[PDB]
Amino acid sequence: SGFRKMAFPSGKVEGCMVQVTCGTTTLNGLWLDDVVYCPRHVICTSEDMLNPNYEDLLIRKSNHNFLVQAGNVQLRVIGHSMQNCVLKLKVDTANPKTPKYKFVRIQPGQTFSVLACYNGSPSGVYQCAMRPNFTIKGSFLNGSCGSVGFNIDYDCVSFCYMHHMELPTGVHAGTDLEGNFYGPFVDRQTAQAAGTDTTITVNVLAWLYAAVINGDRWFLNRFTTTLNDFNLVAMKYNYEPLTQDHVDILGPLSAQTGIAVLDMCASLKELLQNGMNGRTILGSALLEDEFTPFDVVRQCSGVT
Amino acid sequence: SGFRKMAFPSGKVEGCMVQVTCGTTTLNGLWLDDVVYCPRHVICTSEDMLNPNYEDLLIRKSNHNFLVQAGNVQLRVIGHSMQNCVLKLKVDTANPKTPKYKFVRIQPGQTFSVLACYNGSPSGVYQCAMRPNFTIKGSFLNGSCGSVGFNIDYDCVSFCYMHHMELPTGVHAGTDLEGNFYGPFVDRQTAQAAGTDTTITVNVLAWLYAAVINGDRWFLNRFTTTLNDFNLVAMKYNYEPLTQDHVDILGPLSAQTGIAVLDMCASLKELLQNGMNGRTILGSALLEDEFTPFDVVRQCSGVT
Ligand SMILES: *CC(=O)N1CCN(Cc2ccc(Cl)s2)CC1
Numbered sequence: 001s002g003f004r005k006m007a008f009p010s011g012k013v014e015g016c017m018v019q020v021t022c023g024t025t026t027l028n029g030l031w032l033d034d035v036v037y038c039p040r041h042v043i044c045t046s047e048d049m050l051n052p053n054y055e056d057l058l059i060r061k062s063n064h065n066f067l068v069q070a071g072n073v074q075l076r077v078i079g080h081s082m083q084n085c086v087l088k089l090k091v092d093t094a095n096p097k098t099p100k101y102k103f104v105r106i107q108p109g110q111t112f113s114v115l116a117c118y119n120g121s122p123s124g125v126y127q128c129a130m131r132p133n134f135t136i137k138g139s140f141l142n143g144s145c146g147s148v149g150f151n152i153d154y155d156c157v158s159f160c161y162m163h164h165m166e167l168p169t170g171v172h173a174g175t176d177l178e179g180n181f182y183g184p185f186v187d188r189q190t191a192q193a194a195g196t197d198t199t200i201t202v203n204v205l206a207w208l209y210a211a212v213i214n215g216d217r218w219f220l221n222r223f224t225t226t227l228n229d230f231n232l233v234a235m236k237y238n239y240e241p242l243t244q245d246h247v248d249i250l251g252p253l254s255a256q257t258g259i260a261v262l263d264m265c266a267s268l269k270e271l272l273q274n275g276m277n278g279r280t281i282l283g284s285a286l287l288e289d290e291f292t293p294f295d296v297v298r299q300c301s302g303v304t
Numbered sequence: 305s306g307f308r309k310m311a312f313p314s315g316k317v318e319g320c321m322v323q324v325t326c327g328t329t330t331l332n333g334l335w336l337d338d339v340v341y342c343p344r345h346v347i348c349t350s351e352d353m354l355n356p357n358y359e360d361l362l363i364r365k366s367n368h369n370f371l372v373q374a375g376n377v378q379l380r381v382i383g384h385s386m387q388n389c390v391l392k393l394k395v396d397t398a399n400p401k402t403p404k405y406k407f408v409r410i411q412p413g414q415t416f417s418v419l420a421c422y423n424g425s426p427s428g429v430y431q432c433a434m435r436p437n438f439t440i441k442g443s444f445l446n447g448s449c450g451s452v453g454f455n456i457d458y459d460c461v462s463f464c465y466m467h468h469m470e471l472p473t474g475v476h477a478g479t480d481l482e483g484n485f486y487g488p489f490v491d492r493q494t495a496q497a498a499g500t501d502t503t504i505t506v507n508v509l510a511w512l513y514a515a516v517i518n519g520d521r522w523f524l525n526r527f528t529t530t531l532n533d534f535n536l537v538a539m540k541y542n543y544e545p546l547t548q549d550h551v552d553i554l555g556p557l558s559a560q561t562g563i564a565v566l567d568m569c570a571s572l573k574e575l576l577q578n579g580m581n582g583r584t585i586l587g588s589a590l591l592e593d594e595f596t597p598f599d600v601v602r603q604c605s606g607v608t
């Protein structure tokens with residue numbers, strides 16, 4: 001019993017982290033096979049980030065300008081290219097610690113673990129979600145860019161995120177491992193505001209299922225609702241509209257607990273309208289939305 | 305910017321996790337040098353856990369009864385001994401992945417990372433604190449026992465916890481790596497109730513410092529207090545008494561932010577007396593107490 005915000009074990013990703021510098025101090029790269037992936041803003045100066053022309057800046061860079069260090073060992077850069085907002089640095093040595101991996105572009109509401117690194121060295125690991133506004137709520141200081149987000153399915157690491165960007169509101173933006181930003185964000189120091197941070201309704205319901213499984217049940221009530229009725233309340237409270245797809249995804253948690261998805265919707269509706277009244281659910285005083293239904297099943301069943 | 309509940313990178317500990325069985329299904333062990341450490345209740349049957357006599361039960365066990373598996377490779381057990389509530393299984397092979405390590409017994413209020421494992425396989429990593437009642441609030445299902453808690457100082461893993469025990473209230477109990485339980489708990493299926501889960505005041509103040517550093521400042525007020533006045537309010541709300549030692553430990557965060565510890569105490573006092581009024585601090589609706597002052601400095605400074 002007990003339910004915790006849990007990250008994937010980071011070992012497989014720790015084995016992939018390197019340091020990159022290209023004239024203007026350091027950030028992180030991801031070393032898979034004989035390619036090191038890093039944010040293209042590694043090539044920027046303190047004059048460049050306002051209105052950078054990356055193709056023009058890159059022309060001034062040669063393989064020998066990209067200093068790539070794995071622990072205390074230097075890697076030889078034998079090629080470099082820009083793909084969208086990432087650089088791919090070809091090295092002469094395959095990373096011997098390369099795990100089975102995939103690059104996946106996640107949807108908003110999907111969770112992943114971040115391995116926060118500085119200068120190619122891991123500092124810690126935490127769980128995130130891709131927000132509906134395509135930001136993430138991370139912990140990233142100068143030097144953390146190139147830190148990656150991932151899921152693991154048994155032995156295969158799915159990399160979904162690379163850190164690039166802090167908005168003036170202290171939320172985070174980055175790319176998939178093809179270098180495409182999540183949402184409308186750009187690697188330029190400009191006026192970029194996040195949209196509404198809507199709550200991931202399907203994740204809140206998953207977490208209410210987790211609470212019931214782990215003994216927190218005070219918020220179950222005598223009510224039910226419909227998708228359309230629930231969605232009127234979701235709208236008012238900046239919750240994502242609940243779809244039949246979301247209901248279908250919650251089916252296993254419904255089956256295990258014997259609480260119909262629409263009955264749990266009616267619980268969530270009362271919590272939205274009435275608040276917690278100073279009570280907690282799985283040690284939280286607000287409705288947690290960074291556990292997916294898959295996350296709840298995984299943690300509740302002891303998957304490795 | 306941003307402040308997250310962050311665990312240590314788990315790679316160094318993943319390298320140490322094995323599976324142990326001794327007649328009655330499986331739990332985890334920790335493989336350091338040529339010794340595998342595991343809970344002594346691995347030797348129990350379904351008749352034993354009510355009133356186990358571990359010395360008597362152990363007499364029936366030989367080296368060949370302890371099945372120790374690192375991935376798909378079996379380890380040869382050449383000796384076994386009981387130290388308090390752990391077994392030490394001597395194997396003929398030093399773990400080649402043994403990191404620099406220490407065994408430390410932590411004080412209540414100290415935080416650590418847990419690598420949750422099942423059958424010697426890591427499932428995930430989360431941050432805990434040793435509670436003032438010497439429980440921890442974990443995520444542990446059957447098979448998770450032998451999972452360990454740790455801190456890392458650069459390259460040295462300090463192991464502080466091994467999981468043994470779930471109380472009927474769904475909180476967790478275990479031992480240091482010398483096999484001594486934290487608090488009054490025993491590895492017996494009996495009436496064991498946790499005492500008052502008091503809030504770790506010094507950690508709450510640390511986290512309020514973290515909030516200020518990361519832009520969350522609405523709870524700063526025009527007031528100050530004294531240790532004795534604050535402690536009257538701590539008492540009423542089941543907070544640990546604040547000591548001059550705690551004030552001294554918060555000195556660096558005080559210095560960096562320019563907010564006197566006793567002024568932050570006055571903020572915490574108003575939050576206790578008035579509540580959040582529906583507001584949040586670093587994405588929490590309650591006062592977070594599982595970040596130490598060391599944790600806040602580490603995360604706010606990007607230590608690796
Ligand atoms: C996330 C991170 O490390 N940073 C630091 C770099 N910064 C942009 C710049 C790149 C070259 C420079 Cl000189 S400044 C983004 C945030």
Ligand SMILES: *CC(=O)N1CCN(Cc2ccc(Cl)s2)CC1
Pocket residue numbers: 328329331345346347348349350353444445446447448449450467468469470
């Ligand atoms: C934490 C954990 O894995 N468990 C399962 C084992 N249980 C005690 C027992 C040991 C031998 C048995 Cl048979 S049952 C404690 C919780």
